[PDB]
């Protein structure tokens, strides 16, 4: 029961780390050792979702059996059969998805332009997403 | 039975000395050794949450049967068979969800721009999120 | 249960690898040792989706049996039967479909028309492609 | 499960190791060594497609009974049977279809002209196909 | 299951050497050791396709039985039954039907008589065949 | 499964050098050792085809039973049985039949003559038909 939960929180703690390894690969030839520091957080679900869609299509009748009756003197009958489209669909989801992710960097001192270009170099170095209300967030501050 | 909720209480702990050890390895080389202090909490819940949905699509129906009948002389009669779109949904919650947080730094004796930085250093460094009423104060005060 | 999951992020590591090493093979010899710094990130889903279609022509029917009555003095009747033609396809999707794919590419210190040039060698180099909102970042940055 | 997934994944690699075989058999002698580079990108799906149609032909009938009843004075009936050519198929897709390719070639340096004609030559060195959305770009750029 | 697909693989790359060997038998005492160089390329399908045709010959037909009735004073009635022509064929395709093919060949410096004469020979070496999309190329460039 | 069709591919090379020596048979005793050179090239297809026939003859119609009624005062009455000529043929097709034949000859350097007599030679050395779409191409070059 919570013995393979646990196992569930390290593996969240991997996918930091993984990530604390990658921007220590992009900014430490350019910034230097000893002048950055950052650290990253991921929070993920893990939920059992499936799902059943049977859809049709009004639009697109194809008849099949027909009959008619045009008695006059003023007696109109009719009766039809009709054949549609159906698609069914069965997915299940995945159970770990990532929701939302966190990254912080501190520089050592910078003017506008070289924050900006260390920003969108990070853009690609971790993989901001705005659908999934992801944060990033790049500033320099004063060491002591 | 309550065997296993002491193991529960363990896990809520160790969330908490991870937070301990990420807020650690930010704050030290900015501020330094011996000039902060700082503790988190965390509280969860261990419910179980299943749910299953049925849903139907009224705007778009689908003819499969028809009869009528027109008798004027006003005799009017109708009679129709519809189909309609189902989506069935199963879905089996998550157990040990983080519901509020509360983080508490202290900065031994600042102008309001280095405390509004921090701040923002620290944003990203917990995962601060307004959505749960998520709690991060920081503050400097003298120390003895 | 979850050992399995474990597996599947290894899987992505091991894709982001080899970028790497392309990227590697074709800047290394036109930009130099030392000069150039990049990183990948590849994310994929892991969903489980199968579709069942049937579908129908409804512009080309073929009567099979047909009735008729015309009787005159006005009693109008028709009965026919239609045979149209069926499709059935039956597919299963595949797991492990790349989502999206961010590139950056930092180059030390360039007039705008190289980096075009490199932006254009890195799009067939990589396979950036626009349908799948895929990033590709190349500039020119001050080392330290 | 994830075990031949993983097998797949090498597969696509061996493609590309193939062309980048044939690539470098064709621009060595012409261009010679160490004057060139180039990689290029493969990417495949492994759906699992079924079809089957059942077709008929409404312009080509061919009666089998018939009874007709002409009684003047208009009592007019008809009753008639039609048989029809049915052509039923049945097939099953690959797995492993090629989707998109992407070629990029750099030379050290060229003329309009040369860089058409050895366009042209790796048009056919390669298979280069509109339909698929395949890219071929082939440029000259400044070594270093 | 990919077991055997890899060795469908294998199987093209058979062809195009077999496509190697016949340009070299005839390019080499034309043109020349080292005057020439060529590739090929060859993409397959292995689908697995059956049809099944019944067809009828509605302009033909065969009385077997007949009743008449024409009671004057106008009573008509008719009833006849018919005899058709009947063809059924079963068909099952192949397994590795060629789809395309793209053959290049740069000949080291030439008139165009002499091109189109290499390609005219080249026609009939390889089996050039426009009803498959094929392509063929022949070109002179300086080498180096 | 895939090793039988293998198999097949084998057989069409042998075909191929059957020719590559009737042509080595003919050409040599009249042109000379070192002054021509030629290929060829056989696509076959290994479909299976079987054919039901039944065929009437509607214009030789043989009569068994006859009943008539001719009551004046005008009640006319018939009944007619008949027999028919009926046919059934029963027909498997043959797997390897050749499809189309390429055959090119070069020939150092000739009149106009010459070379129609080699063409008229060639058609029964070799059995072009044009039924099939066969090529058969032979001209004169200038070797190197």
Known sequence: ASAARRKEQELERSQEQ???????SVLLPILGYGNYTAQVDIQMDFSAVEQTRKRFDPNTPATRSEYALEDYNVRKESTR???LDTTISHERKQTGTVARQ???VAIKDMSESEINAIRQVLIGT???DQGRG????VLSVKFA
Chains 1, 2, 3, 4, 5, 6 share one sequence.
């Not at 993984?18 to 220590?24: F, G, P, W, Y």
């Open 18 to 24: 993984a990530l604390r390894e990658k921007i220590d």
């Open 81 to 83: 059969n009709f054949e």
């Open 102 to 104: 966190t990254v912080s």
């Open 134 to 137: 992801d944060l990033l967030n």
């Open 126 to 128: 971790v993989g901001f």
